[PDB]
Amino acid sequence: KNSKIFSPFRIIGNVSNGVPFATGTLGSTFYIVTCVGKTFQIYDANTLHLLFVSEKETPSSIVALSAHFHYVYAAYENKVGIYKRGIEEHLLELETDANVEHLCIFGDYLCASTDDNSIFIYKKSDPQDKYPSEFYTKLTVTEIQGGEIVSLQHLATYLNKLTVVTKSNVLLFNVRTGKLVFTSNEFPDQITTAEPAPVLDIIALGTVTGEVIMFNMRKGKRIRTIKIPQSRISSLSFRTDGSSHLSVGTSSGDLIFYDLDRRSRIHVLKNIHRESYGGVTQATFLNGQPIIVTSGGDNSLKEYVFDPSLSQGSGDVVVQPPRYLRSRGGHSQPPSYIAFADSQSHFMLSASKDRSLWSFSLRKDAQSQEMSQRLHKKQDGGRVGGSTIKSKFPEIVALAIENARIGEWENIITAHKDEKFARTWDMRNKRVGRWTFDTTDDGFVKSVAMSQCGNFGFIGS
Amino acid sequence: NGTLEFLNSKKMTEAGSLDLIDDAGENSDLEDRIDNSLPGSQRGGDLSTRKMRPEVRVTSVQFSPTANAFAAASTEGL
Amino acid sequence: SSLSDQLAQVASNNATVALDRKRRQKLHSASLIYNSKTAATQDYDFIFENASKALEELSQIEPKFAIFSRTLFSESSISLDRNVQTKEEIKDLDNAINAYLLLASSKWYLAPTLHATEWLVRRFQIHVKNTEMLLLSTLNYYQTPVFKRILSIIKLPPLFNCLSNFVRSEKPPTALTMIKLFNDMDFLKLYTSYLDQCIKHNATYTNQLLFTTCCFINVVAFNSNNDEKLNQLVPILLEISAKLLASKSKDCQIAAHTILVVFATALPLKKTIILAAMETILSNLDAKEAKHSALLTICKLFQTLKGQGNVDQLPSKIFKLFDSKFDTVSILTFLDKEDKPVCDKFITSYTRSIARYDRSKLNIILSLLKKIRLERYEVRLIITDLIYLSEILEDKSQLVELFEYFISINEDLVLKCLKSLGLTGXXXXXX
Amino acid sequence: EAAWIDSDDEKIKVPILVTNKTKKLRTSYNESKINGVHYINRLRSQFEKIYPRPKWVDDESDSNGDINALTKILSTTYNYKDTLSNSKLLPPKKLDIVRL
Amino acid sequence: KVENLGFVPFEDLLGVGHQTGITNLIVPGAGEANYDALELNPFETKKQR
Amino acid sequence: KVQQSEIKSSVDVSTANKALDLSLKEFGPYHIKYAKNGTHLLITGRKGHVASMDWRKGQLRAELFLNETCHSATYLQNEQYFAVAQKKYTFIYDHEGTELHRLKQHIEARHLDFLPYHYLLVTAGETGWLKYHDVSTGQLVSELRT
RNA sequence: CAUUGGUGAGCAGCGAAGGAUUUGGUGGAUUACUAGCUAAUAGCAAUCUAUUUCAAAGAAUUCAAACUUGGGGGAAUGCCUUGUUGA
């Protein structure tokens, strides 16, 4: 499958795929590291600009992502990989044929967990090593200790202790000695997610039935049982600013915020990610700041801010609703048609099966836009048709653009599936134009074209 | 001057364009700090008298009589 | 950003520290009682001489102010300023002021109270620093001129921006502009914190609770069109009615009944939510004047919701709670009233729980059916459960007397449902 | 109190003055080798300084009628319209129509 | 990169001039707490000035 | 090791609010000259910004956008009259931001200072000369060639 | 009669559980994306201090500089330059 003419560059237009991403503190700033299939990307927090991608693609899909201060740890099919700056700095091989599913890193002890209930421990050879490389031991969870390993977490102020959460119970492992030191009582529900807390010895467990069980690991007893009606829980995080906010993210596209001080709700964000692609897969607060970064399978990554309270004196009671901020995204579907918007190889127009049309950029990956399907007002003074509950245009199957006379009128004609008119789009304004071109013989359009002068557009019934 | 139809919006402050701000004083030397810019030096005799940046224009174009080419005298040269 | 917008943030922070004599003139002229010229030319001790006489008069009225003589109205509380003390003690000064205003929100129609709060305005700058709790305390007296005085002194927070045209206005704020204030989504949550702090400190009275009901009912009525807005407004007024029902007073129970009726009439709810509305009403109901209002509220709450299983059997926990908190004779004498409100869905849901749980007192439903006039489908569901009662219970002759009424009026209905379950001729053999 | 005791957490003798993140955990200046139980107690207090302790972890513990029944139901219910019944009576003042 | 630094003469703050604006770091004991009203008044009205 | 984040918690709210952290991103490194009494502040943007700042209260006496590279500005006798230093000449302003004089001398002023009991404006810049100027009479008193 | 003038009453037509204006705030682009800080071949990011001092290096216009003056006329007191007493 090698070529002597072409060679792959990158995959333009992807942000996330649905794997739970990682974030890493780096001084004051933060980097949001996600993965797209056989590669992975690093996004800055304050601008959502792409910073680094993998120089060489992974042989298979990236299953688990974790990131320390500088070194991003990617976990594909059999091996975990320690990367810096996108460069493959070290490849750590797991001496088993099973697949790696979760990857925790704390201290000198890397913690790789395969799918067949085995936890690998990797030790730094030197105490001043920058990443673990030597192989310490192979912890095993049997069928009498619990179910499959849902997640690996390391709680704060535990000396060489690994917290393992199964589908039925929580275990602890003294990784220096490789010994179980504590087992939790059985949880009747199937635990789906885990997260540490700013309070000590506290881990938050979210189940498939909408229960947040908040397990104090010192006493071995739960504390707060937060109930969510019949929703699959996928994400859990805490706002570490100091205000007691728990963010729980359902897989049904909902994001629920709880005020743990007042034992009350705050806001239920609806449809921040689509249902069919997984919903809110991973959503976490930046550490100490009221900016929550959410991502899912819908190929998007949004940021939401908790504004400061309008009341000057009350504060904690009247809390502001979360408010949309920076977001980068792509099509939720594979893209059908692609054209080029200019001779400079700058902008690429892609119309997908997600009923949309994006103008990606090959030069700067943060320059991409979703071109607006907001109809212009009719010149006649008569109200246009269509539904009051607005939906997107049908899927575009043929496209044509002339770059000669741009910005003074419409320069894109797009042809949709099963529609009896083609639609105009202005590339400079990045907006659907004010003209539709009927075939006038009762026919769907199968081909469209422009003149090179740009004044004339041709429509094929 | 005229290379762009769309100027950037991070250059207008609440008063004055950022690149129109006379930044000759921050230089460490003397001869380029000296401003002899006349007020009406539109297409003058020097460039230190301009007080602006030069504007782009082409002013004389001829086809080559031999080799299917054409030369245009530009601000950038020829 | 720019420069001057950051300066207004500094100016709003330092609007209480006096820098020049002009700034002292424009801060000491804030006056609840005196005019502008008399306020500028009087000393702190002269205000405190009237203040000590004011709080001594208030300690005669209620002795809860005897604490505030030694913490806020001491002679040592003159030299100290809010803008010389650090952040760990200005929070203690804030809630001490908030504790005083809650204990003095009722006492405002008396000139001793206005003289007492005048020195708290001047010495502790409460017309700039904590303007919210001052304005919430006097909000029910908006017709009175002391609210027009308070608006002429105060600087408005961003949440009470609807009263921005009523500062220094010769006409008082009206009823329509108070609802436009309460229509804000965030302000309802802030009044919830004010009301929850009002109930917790056990100083809730008639006039502020009459006014709070008069605005809570209107804000549902003004939002009756937008169904999305009333969905957003459900967790506030139900949590208020949860806290108002938890109060042991004679006034908060009736005020919670007023909120719970009109909200459900303007918005049908899930059955389990209105089932929880029964148990919270039925829990701490002991006031004699509130027992009649509670029976009419449960009556109205049952006919609000519509659907299958609307008039089904109650849980046994709720039924025995209703049996203890309401005698069967008491609800019969309630039905004796010739006004006779619409209790149709509640009664047929009450007697199905009677036929299921106690299975002993069927003389009440003989008196219940003779008193009330019931609709068609509710009678069918009563007879169907009494037919099921005829199968399992060791049938006494009062069950035959109950079906004797059922064949005395609308005998086709009992005959039709007997054809649905069993044989028509088998009824006499089984009873 | 304690639901588990790590037997191999007392014999450990970590150094403290070798990394700048742990150099704020010393209390004297002539201590460098500190055993684990003192070290994990010191590191707990340093973590309490970095992240504070909010009041809900301590003040709340879940462990004939009731008064918090409305509060309990409002926590467990997220949609409040009686529309899942299909009540066979149309809601007044609003109409749900579809045009074909 | 700081440009200059100057103390408030009768309070205790140093004003450090950086590239992105102005900060005032608090110090305990820079300024003198007993100013002379016949030379320099922080609280000076118009007619006194 | 004591930091400004925990000083502000343990310091009274008068000087806590006086800890003014501005943010003027769009211009150069700002030069600060307080008045001789701590009541007014003067910023000198390296690109264009001079604001006759009233500091303890939030008022702003004069905002000026001077497109030449301003270097150093100072209040001279009160909070009213202040003098900035441009690319080539030293200007002198009032409380309203109006020009008062264009000083024909002080032909470079990188560092401009004032000493109050003589009404003496001093200037010495990239030129070697130090020029003494009297703001009370307008007579350039001395011109020292260093 | 034209109105190529304004103000109002309607109709034809356009017309999927509203539609027109007008406006505040925020976010993303408006040049082509290799991450924060520091004393930087490394460390920090929960810190650089009970490790940051010594040593080494480091001095010409032999004692150098307004290349930056609106013009005319002077310049008493100034200032500059060159000649005139005593260590």
Side-chain angles (χ1 to χ4, degrees):
Chain A
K1 73 160 301 308
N2 201 357
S3 169
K4 68 189 275 192
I5 297 304
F6 301 110
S7 301
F9 196 41
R10 71 184 312 271
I11 304 154
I12 292 286
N14 272 332
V15 169
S16 175
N17 71 328
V19 181
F21 68 96
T23 180
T25 206
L26 179 61
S28 52
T29 196
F30 296 90
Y31 61 96
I32 300 148
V33 54
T34 69
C35 76
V36 180
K38 307 188 163 191
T39 183
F40 82 110
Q41 297 186 1
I42 296 174
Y43 285 118
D44 203 77
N46 208 6
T47 49
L48 280 189
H49 297 165
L50 171 63
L51 316 174
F52 319 94
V53 312
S54 81
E55 209 180 7
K56 297 312 213 269
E57 294 150 347
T58 79
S60 302
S61 278
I62 296 187
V63 198
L65 260 184
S66 172
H68 216 52
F69 299 144
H70 261 276
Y71 298 104
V72 52
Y73 297 90
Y76 51 89
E77 41 169 355
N78 194 14
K79 311 171 286 297
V80 299
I82 314 156
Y83 305 143
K84 174 175 78 161
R85 217 163 269 276
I87 314 161
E88 182 185 287
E89 191 165 354
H90 188 277
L91 177 57
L92 188 42
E93 216 283 319
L94 264 77
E95 322 293 322
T96 281
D97 310 328
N99 285 3
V100 192
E101 50 155 354
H102 295 80
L103 185 64
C104 170
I105 287 96
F106 68 100
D108 48 353
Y109 293 147
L110 192 140
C111 261
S113 84
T114 47
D115 55 342
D116 58 338
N117 276 303
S118 162
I119 301 149
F120 281 83
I121 314 295
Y122 284 103
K123 182 196 98 67
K124 289 180 185 212
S125 199
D126 215 5
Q128 57 265 50
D129 274 329
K130 278 147 181 173
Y131 37 79
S133 299
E134 305 211 352
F135 162 66
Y136 196 83
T137 187
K138 184 183 173 277
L139 285 158
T140 314
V141 166
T142 50
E143 294 296 321
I144 67 167
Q145 286 147 327
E148 66 104 17
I149 305 162
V150 177
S151 159
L152 288 195
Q153 298 308 306
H154 163 76
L155 273 180
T157 72
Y158 281 166
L159 210 69
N160 314 326
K161 258 85 70 179
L162 173 67
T163 83
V164 189
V165 46
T166 74
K167 291 193 148 167
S168 172
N169 44 357
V170 191
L171 320 173
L172 266 159
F173 277 140
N174 191 8
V175 290
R176 200 262 317 279
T177 71
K179 290 182 173 65
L180 172 76
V181 300
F182 172 72
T183 166
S184 168
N185 282 332
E186 45 94 17
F187 293 90
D189 288 325
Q190 312 267 269
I191 313 167
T192 57
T193 178
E195 188 71 39
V199 278
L200 285 94
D201 310 351
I202 296 286
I203 183 173
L205 309 178
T207 60
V208 48
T209 69
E211 305 201 5
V212 168
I213 292 102
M214 261 207 48
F215 192 55
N216 186 21
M217 283 252 299
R218 180 58 45 89
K219 296 198 282 281
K221 292 202 184 306
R222 78 182 58 177
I223 300 191
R224 309 290 295 122
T225 301
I226 294 189
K227 182 76 178 46
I228 292 101
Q230 295 96 24
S231 290
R232 161 151 196 141
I233 286 171
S234 160
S235 303
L236 277 175
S237 157
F238 302 92
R239 189 184 149 169
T240 69
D241 177 77
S243 43
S244 310
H245 283 49
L246 162 72
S247 67
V248 56
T250 83
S251 71
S252 46
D254 290 342
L255 194 53
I256 309 150
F257 293 108
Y258 257 61
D259 199 290
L260 311 162
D261 294 324
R262 320 201 309 110
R263 301 171 143 221
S264 159
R265 274 194 299 126
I266 285 153
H267 221 279
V268 284
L269 296 163
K270 313 296 198 76
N271 277 356
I272 78 173
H273 292 323
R274 314 281 301 121
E275 291 56 10
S276 72
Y277 301 97
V280 193
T281 61
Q282 184 50 57
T284 175
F285 280 102
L286 298 192
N287 177 80
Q289 302 90 4
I291 293 188
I292 173 168
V293 173
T294 169
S295 171
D298 52 340
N299 198 12
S300 163
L301 190 139
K302 297 194 180 301
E303 290 182 356
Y304 293 61
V305 195
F306 277 100
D307 298 331
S309 63
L310 280 173
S311 169
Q312 47 183 179
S314 285
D316 315 288
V317 173
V318 153
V319 85
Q320 272 297 289
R323 165 187 80 87
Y324 168 81
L325 211 78
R326 272 97 70 178
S327 72
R328 309 270 161 200
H331 321 272
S332 317
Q333 300 270 358
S336 68
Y337 201 91
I338 36 161
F340 270 61
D342 45 353
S343 299
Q344 303 293 325
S345 82
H346 196 178
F347 277 70
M348 268 198 336
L349 307 173
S350 65
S352 87
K353 313 170 59 53
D354 210 27
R355 312 271 277 275
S356 88
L357 177 49
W358 282 68
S359 83
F360 295 138
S361 170
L362 298 149
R363 274 179 177 188
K364 174 175 220 178
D365 284 332
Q367 276 186 10
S368 70
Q369 281 205 20
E370 171 166 1
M371 256 183 26
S372 75
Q373 325 193 357
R374 205 182 77 197
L375 276 82
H376 281 278
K377 275 86 177 174
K378 211 185 218 182
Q379 69 276 17
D380 181 74
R383 41 182 64 227
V384 300
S387 158
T388 42
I389 297 183
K390 311 299 290 284
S391 283
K392 309 225 176 194
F393 292 149
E395 186 259 339
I396 295 180
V397 86
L399 200 146
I401 180 171
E402 180 54 51
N403 211 38
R405 274 147 176 86
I406 179 147
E408 39 262 17
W409 50 81
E410 296 92 358
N411 72 316
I412 306 161
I413 282 169
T414 59
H416 332 298
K417 159 158 302 303
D418 73 34
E419 290 303 317
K420 325 190 171 289
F421 37 80
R423 264 186 181 84
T424 48
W425 305 79
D426 203 354
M427 175 59 217
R428 154 150 309 170
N429 277 359
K430 307 190 167 59
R431 171 179 187 82
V432 50
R434 58 215 200 275
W435 309 118
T436 71
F437 301 145
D438 207 327
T439 46
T440 71
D441 60 332
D442 163 347
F444 312 119
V445 153
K446 297 318 291 193
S447 277
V448 281
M450 291 275 168
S451 74
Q452 209 189 5
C453 77
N455 300 116
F456 277 120
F458 321 111
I459 300 266
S461 69
Chain B
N1 280 321
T3 198
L4 269 178
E5 300 254 325
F6 282 10
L7 284 175
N8 201 5
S9 159
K10 261 91 76 170
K11 289 204 183 320
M12 208 222 311
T13 76
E14 53 189 1
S17 177
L18 207 55
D19 89 343
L20 290 192
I21 284 173
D22 308 341
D23 213 358
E26 280 184 33
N27 301 332
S28 49
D29 215 317
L30 159 73
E31 299 95 347
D32 76 84
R33 256 194 307 115
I34 287 165
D35 210 356
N36 63 356
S37 66
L38 291 295
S41 172
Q42 174 256 353
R43 184 211 60 111
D46 265 354
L47 203 137
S48 167
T49 73
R50 169 74 53 171
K51 217 179 64 180
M52 313 298 304
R53 272 169 283 99
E55 64 267 14
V56 76
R57 84 280 188 274
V58 305
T59 174
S60 177
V61 197
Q62 275 201 351
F63 266 95
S64 63
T66 55
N68 207 26
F70 73 106
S74 305
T75 301
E76 211 56 48
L78 174 42
Chain C
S1 86
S2 71
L3 191 132
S4 197
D5 49 352
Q6 320 201 32
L7 295 208
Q9 189 260 352
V10 187
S12 43
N13 283 324
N14 268 352
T16 41
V17 55
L19 308 168
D20 302 332
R21 208 201 307 277
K22 173 178 166 174
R23 294 294 311 274
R24 182 52 68 103
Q25 270 217 28
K26 223 181 279 165
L27 260 63
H28 212 273
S29 72
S31 185
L32 266 170
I33 290 175
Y34 309 104
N35 62 83
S36 185
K37 297 306 167 29
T38 318
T41 71
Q42 64 190 36
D43 209 355
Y44 275 157
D45 175 80
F46 167 67
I47 311 150
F48 193 78
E49 286 161 352
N50 316 330
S52 180
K53 295 168 207 171
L55 198 136
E56 198 269 341
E57 203 73 37
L58 283 194
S59 294
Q60 171 71 25
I61 292 169
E62 47 167 353
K64 309 294 153 189
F65 296 124
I67 293 182
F68 286 110
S69 80
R70 85 197 179 213
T71 167
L72 265 171
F73 277 65
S74 170
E75 278 80 37
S76 43
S77 63
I78 285 160
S79 51
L80 67 103
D81 197 282
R82 287 191 51 156
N83 281 336
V84 76
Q85 290 203 336
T86 84
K87 258 297 302 187
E88 52 93 18
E89 70 263 52
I90 202 171
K91 177 183 56 57
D92 314 341
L93 191 43
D94 274 332
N95 51 34
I97 287 170
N98 299 338
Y100 166 68
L101 288 179
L102 264 183
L103 286 177
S105 84
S106 64
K107 274 85 177 173
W108 215 274
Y109 275 146
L110 324 166
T113 86
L114 192 46
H115 274 286
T117 63
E118 183 168 36
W119 177 81
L120 199 68
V121 159
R122 288 166 186 266
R123 198 56 214 85
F124 290 92
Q125 310 316 302
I126 75 168
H127 67 287
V128 182
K129 283 318 263 186
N130 40 357
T131 61
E132 301 157 330
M133 182 75 38
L134 175 64
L135 261 172
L136 298 166
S137 72
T138 185
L139 199 50
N140 39 312
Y141 316 120
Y142 67 99
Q143 276 106 346
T144 75
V146 74
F147 195 90
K148 188 205 82 95
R149 186 73 201 163
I150 275 181
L151 290 179
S152 309
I153 297 154
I154 216 160
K155 180 189 94 71
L156 287 183
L159 283 158
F160 319 133
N161 220 330
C162 163
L163 299 174
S164 169
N165 37 13
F166 270 113
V167 284
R168 311 162 174 277
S169 170
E170 312 269 40
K171 304 197 177 85
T174 178
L176 197 135
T177 191
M178 211 46 48
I179 302 309
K180 289 270 292 307
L181 171 67
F182 260 98
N183 211 351
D184 172 82
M185 172 37 49
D186 300 311
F187 171 58
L188 277 168
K189 264 168 169 168
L190 192 173
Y191 213 91
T192 307
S193 177
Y194 169 65
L195 262 178
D196 196 13
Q197 198 178 1
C198 200
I199 296 153
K200 174 200 58 182
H201 289 165
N202 312 342
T204 68
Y205 54 100
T206 76
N207 208 350
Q208 76 102 17
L209 219 49
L210 274 149
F211 167 69
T212 314
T213 44
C214 204
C215 79
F216 279 177
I217 295 315
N218 265 294
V219 75
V220 181
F222 267 26
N223 281 341
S224 86
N225 268 311
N226 307 323
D227 207 357
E228 169 58 51
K229 197 53 81 164
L230 262 183
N231 175 337
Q232 180 60 77
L233 197 161
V234 83
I236 316 157
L237 264 75
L238 280 200
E239 272 290 323
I240 288 152
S241 78
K243 290 153 206 141
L244 216 60
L245 269 168
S247 167
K248 278 269 298 170
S249 59
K250 276 81 61 182
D251 204 299
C252 312
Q253 303 178 357
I254 307 173
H257 289 128
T258 315
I259 295 159
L260 277 165
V261 163
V262 194
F263 187 75
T265 316
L267 196 90
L269 316 168
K270 305 295 284 183
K271 162 73 162 298
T272 64
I273 309 179
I274 321 180
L275 270 190
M278 298 338 158
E279 272 190 350
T280 47
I281 280 157
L282 217 51
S283 80
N284 263 329
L285 178 78
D286 266 347
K288 175 60 217 69
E289 63 149 351
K291 278 220 167 189
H292 153 67
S293 160
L295 189 46
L296 193 39
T297 289
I298 292 173
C299 162
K300 195 78 166 194
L301 277 167
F302 258 96
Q303 279 205 356
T304 38
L305 75 151
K306 297 174 287 294
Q308 62 270 38
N310 192 6
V311 291
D312 273 17
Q313 292 154 342
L314 315 176
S316 162
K317 180 182 217 173
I318 314 182
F319 172 66
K320 283 190 206 78
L321 201 64
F322 187 74
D323 202 6
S324 302
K325 291 278 179 130
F326 268 110
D327 200 289
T328 70
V329 185
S330 70
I331 204 170
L332 276 172
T333 54
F334 155 73
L335 288 165
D336 190 86
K337 286 154 189 280
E338 280 74 353
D339 196 63
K340 212 189 304 164
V342 289
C343 328
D344 262 341
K345 283 173 183 184
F346 178 47
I347 281 164
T348 178
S349 189
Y350 179 41
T351 182
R352 285 185 76 191
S353 293
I354 284 172
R356 160 71 37 87
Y357 290 132
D358 51 74
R359 299 191 176 185
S360 57
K361 31 177 73 174
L362 289 197
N363 43 358
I364 36 179
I365 188 49
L366 179 172
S367 52
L368 274 161
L369 278 160
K370 286 176 68 67
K371 272 218 183 87
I372 205 65
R373 154 61 201 191
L374 271 159
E375 310 149 1
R376 196 87 175 278
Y377 79 104
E378 298 159 324
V379 163
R380 183 170 330 259
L381 242 192
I382 284 168
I383 295 187
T384 316
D385 260 355
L386 276 198
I387 277 174
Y388 279 160
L389 192 136
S390 77
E391 187 67 39
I392 185 168
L393 188 133
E394 190 168 359
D395 307 296
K396 319 194 171 188
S397 293
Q398 59 183 242
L399 183 57
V400 195
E401 293 153 41
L402 255 294
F403 277 83
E404 260 174 342
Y405 179 74
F406 281 149
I407 64 157
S408 76
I409 166 68
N410 223 27
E411 59 261 11
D412 57 340
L413 191 139
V414 54
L415 259 286
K416 268 171 62 176
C417 68
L418 263 172
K419 281 150 167 179
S420 81
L421 310 174
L423 157 69
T424 76
Chain D
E1 322 170 14
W4 56 270
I5 293 156
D6 194 10
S7 52
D8 300 1
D9 212 9
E10 191 210 9
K11 301 167 279 290
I12 186 162
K13 188 172 284 291
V14 81
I16 272 183
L17 309 181
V18 293
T19 321
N20 317 126
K21 59 195 73 191
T22 64
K23 275 180 81 174
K24 59 168 70 180
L25 270 79
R26 49 151 146 90
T27 54
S28 173
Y29 281 81
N30 296 329
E31 39 178 3
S32 188
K33 310 204 61 201
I34 283 176
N35 50 347
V37 55
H38 277 239
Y39 177 76
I40 208 78
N41 179 37
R42 275 165 147 109
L43 192 54
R44 160 176 320 272
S45 166
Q46 182 50 242
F47 192 80
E48 271 155 329
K49 177 199 305 306
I50 291 156
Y51 294 90
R53 177 198 198 78
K55 66 110 173 179
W56 56 268
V57 69
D58 225 9
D59 204 271
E60 321 297 314
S61 290
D62 278 323
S63 80
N64 304 326
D66 42 350
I67 187 53
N68 44 359
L70 206 64
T71 309
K72 265 179 272 211
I73 285 301
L74 282 170
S75 62
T76 59
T77 313
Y78 274 30
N79 257 319
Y80 309 83
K81 261 306 172 182
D82 193 15
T83 179
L84 273 188
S85 175
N86 311 115
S87 160
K88 309 170 174 65
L89 292 153
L90 301 94
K93 208 57 90 179
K94 283 283 201 233
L95 202 139
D96 36 4
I97 215 161
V98 195
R99 194 181 165 210
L100 303 178
Chain E
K1 304 307 191 285
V2 308
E3 183 49 59
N4 82 304
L5 85 177
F7 306 103
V8 48
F10 301 114
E11 286 144 28
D12 38 2
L13 296 101
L14 73 159
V16 200
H18 47 99
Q19 314 165 204
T20 80
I22 309 302
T23 43
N24 285 349
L25 313 169
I26 314 177
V27 283
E32 46 182 355
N34 318 283
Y35 63 96
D36 198 281
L38 293 192
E39 322 292 320
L40 278 170
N41 267 307
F43 322 121
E44 185 150 271
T45 190
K46 159 169 83 166
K47 281 180 275 171
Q48 200 163 1
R49 192 260 319 279
Chain F
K1 301 180 206 184
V2 163
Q3 274 172 346
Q4 305 301 294
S5 67
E6 71 101 16
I7 276 175
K8 288 203 203 202
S9 44
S10 281
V11 160
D12 55 337
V13 85
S14 59
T15 38
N17 283 8
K18 278 171 180 61
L20 166 67
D21 308 27
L22 282 175
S23 288
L24 307 169
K25 212 84 57 188
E26 72 265 22
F27 290 131
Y30 281 87
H31 177 270
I32 305 178
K33 176 61 184 308
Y34 276 56
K36 268 82 64 181
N37 43 349
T39 170
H40 279 68
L41 191 171
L42 195 42
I43 47 175
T44 318
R46 185 62 38 84
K47 279 194 195 314
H49 209 70
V50 164
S52 177
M53 171 95 78
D54 208 307
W55 165 58
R56 295 149 317 128
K57 73 200 75 57
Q59 280 167 11
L60 179 71
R61 309 267 170 230
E63 175 174 30
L64 281 183
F65 275 71
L66 317 82
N67 289 4
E68 315 185 8
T69 70
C70 315
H71 288 89
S72 297
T74 180
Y75 300 106
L76 46 83
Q77 72 158 5
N78 282 114
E79 51 258 23
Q80 297 201 239
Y81 309 100
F82 69 99
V84 317
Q86 312 275 74
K87 177 173 68 175
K88 207 176 174 183
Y89 295 92
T90 299
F91 299 163
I92 165 175
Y93 294 140
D94 215 325
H95 60 282
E96 280 191 26
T98 78
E99 293 182 353
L100 313 179
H101 319 262
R102 188 200 92 113
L103 298 171
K104 255 187 175 178
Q105 304 95 324
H106 332 284
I107 84 173
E108 283 307 317
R110 293 291 101 88
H111 322 66
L112 153 70
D113 267 332
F114 198 88
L115 59 96
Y117 290 114
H118 299 61
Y119 282 132
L120 227 52
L121 190 84
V122 311
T123 39
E126 207 150 351
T127 65
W129 292 73
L130 192 137
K131 308 215 200 211
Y132 274 106
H133 204 103
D134 188 17
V135 303
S136 161
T137 55
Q139 181 147 2
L140 188 129
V141 165
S142 160
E143 214 183 17
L144 317 151
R145 182 186 49 173
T146 60

